[PDB]
Design a protein around this ligand. Sequence first.
Ligand SMILES: OC(c1ccc(NCC(F)(F)F)cc1)(C(F)(F)F)C(F)(F)F
Ligand SMILES: OC(c1ccc(NCC(F)(F)F)cc1)(C(F)(F)F)C(F)(F)F
Lengths: 232, 238
Amino acid sequence: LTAAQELMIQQLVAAQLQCNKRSFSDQPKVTPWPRDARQQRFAHFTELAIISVQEIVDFAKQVPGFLQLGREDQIALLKASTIEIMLLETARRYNHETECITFLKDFTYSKDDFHRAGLQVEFINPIFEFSRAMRRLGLDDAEYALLIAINIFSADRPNVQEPGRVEALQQPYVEALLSYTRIKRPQDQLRFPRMLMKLVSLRTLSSVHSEQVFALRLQDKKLPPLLSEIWD
Amino acid sequence: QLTAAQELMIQQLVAAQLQCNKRSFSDQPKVTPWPLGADPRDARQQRFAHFTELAIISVQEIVDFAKQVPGFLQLGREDQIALLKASTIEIMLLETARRYNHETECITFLKDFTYSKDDFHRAGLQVEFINPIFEFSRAMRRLGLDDAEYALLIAINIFSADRPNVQEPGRVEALQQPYVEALLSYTRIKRPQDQLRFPRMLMKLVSLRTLSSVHSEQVFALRLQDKKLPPLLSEIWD
Ligand SMILES: OC(c1ccc(NCC(F)(F)F)cc1)(C(F)(F)F)C(F)(F)F
Ligand SMILES: OC(c1ccc(NCC(F)(F)F)cc1)(C(F)(F)F)C(F)(F)F
């Protein structure tokens, strides 16, 4: 691992740690978790999502190479990546012992909790299978952080005006992850491929998420403004 | 070095490819011809019909191919259907890319026929699907894949355990793995100095998932313009 690779990785891990501290040390400002409570558990979920979106935008801004893309490309990359980063983070926050997703102490969510928020079967089960598959890979914080950076610099997102530049920005992160995994687990050649394959799954999960949003609109459950900008 | 089994798995796929591609040359003159000689909506419809007809041929070759991949026919039939339903357009996009010619900026299909970006537009498709297809083909060309690499990628694509409605995803993952390992060892040998080729190949699987969605948006949009899929395509993609 070169000096520049160490600096890039260390910067990503420190930014991930600062973003978590900034966004999820204090109690989140959310509708208290209780027709009456169907709208309220949904709102709750929606306010959590907004807090994660904010965290993700904060993190993206600190990824070397991002804030130097053209502004429209920044927006286009974040628009597509957001739900996928959320799925990764949800997998990070997953606890196989309890089968729940922990944001901080006293804020955890199970498959049942998701159903009560109005969410379909078609969205919940993939989320939870993907989370437990992520755990069997046993990614550490550097691996997650690098995977997020790679995810952001995907040159095939809709409305990207400079795909050549995005792809060149992705390469160093791919190279760092390749090196990192070679050093960590030298006798585990499929670890790295297995990680990239989860990026595939994340594209599908994004579509399945969009279907949840469209389905929610059918129960007069609209996304609030900060999420509407991104998803409907 | 590739083991005997890896060499045979590749040779098997590459030769199934060929026996399946026999339907392409024999159905070529049966197809609704591309219309020559047209003013500005007759010809629009004939071009589209032409496109649906080649897609049908492709659907059938992909079905025939998959039945030859070892272990496929031992999957539960509902799972066979679910993998093909999802993989079909993605394999077609791989085949489209494989046939892209950068000199003419045209795609070959079924041996002799070729299509430009503007031919796709003339057949009623929209820029939101067409541009990504051609960028993907250009990107695929820069990787310089050979017949073995494409065949391995298609097998990897078929055996994607995370398709919708798959009932035994673990049985699918178990079939995929040796193909992934074969591709890793293949690229390592072919290009020992290019460590990023293999990751870039895997990332083409990511792009294929998005293109699949864009294709669904294209089919939706085509119905607005009197262009509904025929029965065999309807059941896979509507
Ligand atoms: O967009 C929603 C959403 C729910 C959960 C998440 N995060 C959980 C996970 F796993 F999807 F990432 C993100 C968005 C919402 F509205 F709740 F925020 C959805 F319910 F409509 F799908
Ligand atoms: O589904 C269609 C289709 C068109 C071209 C292809 N193959 C070209 C490529 F690049 F997508 F693979 C496949 C399906 C159709 F209808 F022509 F078959 C679409 F036009 F509606 F999209």
